[PDB]
Amino acid sequence: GQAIKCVVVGDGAVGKTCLLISYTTNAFSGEYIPTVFDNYSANVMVDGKPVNLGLWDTAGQEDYDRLRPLSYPQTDVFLICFSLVSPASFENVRAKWYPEVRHHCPNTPIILVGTKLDLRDDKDTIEKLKEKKLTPITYPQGLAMAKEIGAVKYLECSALTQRGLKTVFDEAIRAVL
Ligand SMILES: Nc1nc2c(ncn2[C@@H]2O[C@H](COP(=O)(O)OP(=O)(O)NP(=O)(O)O)[C@@H](O)[C@H]2O)c(=O)[nH]1
Ligand SMILES: [Mg+2]
């Protein structure tokens, strides 16, 4: 029944594509193949209602900055994604993604999505960020970023384990219905 265009943006290698592949097909590959542009689809049921969810997977890489806004018109909801184990990808939520999205789409709801949850509390990945004086992004920190960018929701997920995965898209839909 209801068509909903959801566009997915965020830094190169945060897990945009994996998130969408894991959700639509239940697969996960460890291999990194940088997106140019891809389209996904899902027929979902949310709070009683049938939804045709269109999923626009954009290129995270800087080289695509002039092309990426071509995808923006008519968007119903954005997911702005960052990796929970990349503080730099997190800063870019506010330094790059929020301003870019808002530049072309002043009113479209934003869901902030922290990705790679399976690594956030991983004892080992913590010590390995600690060398570079880095710390994974915690839940309240993510919450505070969502408020800072006026996001409708803050959600955390893992494409690998699928923890928090369905909610991301339920809530993307709920922000539109
Ligand atoms: N441990 C873990 N790795 C993940 C997860 N999601 C993605 N990755 C890994 O992170 C890398 C980048 O994934 P990808 O989905 O391609 O990122 P992207 O945001 O789509 N990149 P691009 O903007 O360049 O298209 C891959 O090696 C992938 O296997 C996750 O939930 N957990
Ligand atoms: Mg990709």
From Swiss-Prot:
S-S bridge residues: none
Keyword set, alphabetical order: Cell membrane, Cell projection, Cytoplasm, Disease variant, Glycoprotein, GTP-binding, Hydrolase, Intellectual disability, Isopeptide bond, Lipoprotein, Membrane, Methylation, Nucleotide-binding, Nucleus, Palmitate, Phosphoprotein, Prenylation, Synapse, Ubl conjugation
Effect of L70A: Strongly reduced interaction with PLCB2
Free-text activity regulation comment from the record: Regulated by guanine nucleotide exchange factors (GEFs) which promote the exchange of bound GDP for free GTP, GTPase activating proteins (GAPs) which increase the GTP hydrolysis activity, and GDP dissociation inhibitors which inhibit the dissociation of the nucleotide from the GTPase. GTP hydrolysis is stimulated by ARHGAP30.
Residues recorded as bearing (Microbial infection) O-AMP-threonine in the entry: T35
GO molecular function: enzyme binding; G protein activity; GTP binding; GTP-dependent protein binding; GTPase activity; protein kinase binding; protein-containing complex binding; Rho GDP-dissociation inhibitor binding
Catalytically driven reaction(s): GTP + H2O = GDP + phosphate + H(+)
SUPFAM superfamilies linked: P-loop containing nucleoside triphosphate hydrolases
Annotated phenotype, changing T35A: Abolishes AMPylation by Vibrio VopS
Any GO BP: neuron migration
Effect of K166R: Loss of FBXL19-induced polyubiquitination
Post-translational changes noted in the entry: GTP-bound active form is ubiquitinated at Lys-147 by HACE1, leading to its degradation by the proteasome. Phosphorylated by AKT at Ser-71.
Record-listed cross-link Glycyl lysine isopeptide (Lys-Gly) (interchain with G-Cter in ubiquitin), residues: K147, K166
Gene3D superfamilies: P-loop containing nucleotide triphosphate hydrolases
Cellular component per GO, a single term: secretory granule membrane
Quaternary structure (record): Interacts with NISCH. Interacts with PIP5K1A. Interacts with the GTP-bound form of RAB7A. Interacts with SRGAP2. Interacts with CYFIP1/SRA-1. Interacts with PLXNB3. Interacts with ARHGDIA; the interaction is induced by SEMA5A, mediated through PLXNB3 and inactivates and stabilizes RAC1. Interacts (GTP-bound form preferentially) with PKN2 (via the REM repeats); the interaction stimulates autophosphorylation and phosphorylation of PKN2. Interacts with the GEF proteins PREX1, RASGRF2, FARP1, FARP2, DOCK1, DOCK2 and DOCK7, which promote the exchange between GDP and GTP, and therefore activate it.
Entry comment, domain topic: The effector region mediates interaction with DEF6.
Similarity annotation: Belongs to the small GTPase superfamily. Rho family.
Protein name per the record: Ras-related C3 botulinum toxin substrate 1
